[PDB]
A paper describes a structure:
It is caused by the [name] (MPXV), a double-stranded DNA virus from the Poxviridae family, that replicates in the cytoplasm and must encode for its own RNA processing machinery including the capping machinery. Here, we present crystal structures of its 2′-O-RNA methyltransferase (MTase) [name] in complex with the pan-MTase inhibitor sinefungin and a series of inhibitors that were discovered based on it. The structure revealed a mixed α/β fold that resembles the Rossmann fold.
We screened a small in-house library of SAH analogs that contains compounds bearing large aromatic or heterocyclic substituents at this position. Among them, three (TO1111, TO1116, TO1119) had a relatively small substituent (small aliphatic chain or iodine atom) and five ([name], TO494, TO500, TO504, TO507) had a large aromatic or heterocyclic substituent. Surprisingly, the efficacy of these compounds was very similar (IC50 = 0.08−0.17 µM) and an order of magnitude better than sinefungin (IC50 = 2.3 µM). To confirm our hypothesis that the inhibitors use the discovered water-filled cavity we performed a crystallographic analysis. We used the same approach as with sinefungin and we were able to obtain well diffracting crystals for five compounds ([name], TO494, TO500, TO507, TO1119). The crystallographic analysis revealed that in each case the moiety attached to the 7-deaza position is located within the water cavity. TO1119 that only slightly disrupts the water network has IC50 = 128 nM while all the inhibitors with bulky substituents had a lower IC50 except for the only substituent that is able to form a hydrogen bond, the TO500 that possesses a benzimidazole heterocycle. These results suggest that for optimal inhibitor binding it is probably important to disrupt the water network, but it is not important to replace it with other hydrogen bonds.
Residue numbers in the entry: 1 to 23, 34 to 141, 147 to 215, 219 to 297
Amino acid sequence: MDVVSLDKPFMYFEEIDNELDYELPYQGQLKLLLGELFFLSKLQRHGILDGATVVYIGSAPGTHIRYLRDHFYNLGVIIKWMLIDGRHHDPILNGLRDVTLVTRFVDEEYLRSIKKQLHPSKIILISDVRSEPSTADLLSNYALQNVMISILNPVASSLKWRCPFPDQWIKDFYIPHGNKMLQPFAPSYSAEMRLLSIYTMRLTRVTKSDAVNYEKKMYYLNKIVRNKVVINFDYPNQEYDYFHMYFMLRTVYCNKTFPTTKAKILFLQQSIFRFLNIP
Ligand SMILES: Nc1ncnc2c1c(C#Cc1ccccc1)cn2[C@@H]1O[C@H](CSCC[C@H](N)C(=O)O)[C@@H](O)[C@H]1O
């Protein structure tokens, strides 16, 4: 891995400043855990996580979600979880009174009834639904996620966002405004991000040129940026993904006090890796 010297990683897609012509155990749970710890801890900074209800659609198996609960439960934040998926959840989510497990594939009708029974409580939406996927599949998925936002009307949302490849384009489509969070420990050449929105919902047109820009910026990120060693980085592991994770984990609150920020992040990573059984 070529060495580099960085003050900060690329946190959002917009920050990628170059492009290139495209050519761990249970790492998926770690990717989701970090991204949702980042999202929900940003909402905790804005004082809008407390009292809300996280509706997580496409949450199964959702092993990492148990860490998410326990984290915010141990911080005293009052959160109710509603995990909705047609598949069965990881049994480690069992026996939690503040976590509701729902075995159902959501549609427009069922989103209406969810909203009725949670209204007027704050809803926070995390969607990870998926139906290799074609562009029609992605378009249907993203149409469903817009439907989720229009009906649930969440105070914030984190949406699975991967632009369809330019060589598989079908038509222009619309997604909500928001910041496109980059995911550490994503698969080596994944172009998936999490669309993070805080609602105060305007839709944005996505064009085939955007698809090209995504494909080229993410390839530069995956081929060049993520294969670097951050030599100035003071951490037991200086590979970019750990540098990336480190900056996400410092937005996380914690009840315990540490002599240094590095001490905190190290403890957090130790706690996350241990629970997910990562060496
Ligand atoms: N409507 C829905 N409601 C509930 N769950 C739905 C769906 C749907 C769909 C659809 C659809 C959309 C438009 C038109 C027609 C159909 C998919 N899923 C679930 O998304 C997960 C992806 S992988 C999660 C991984 C997980 N985050 C983990 O912790 O590992 C799977 O578990 C799958 O069962």
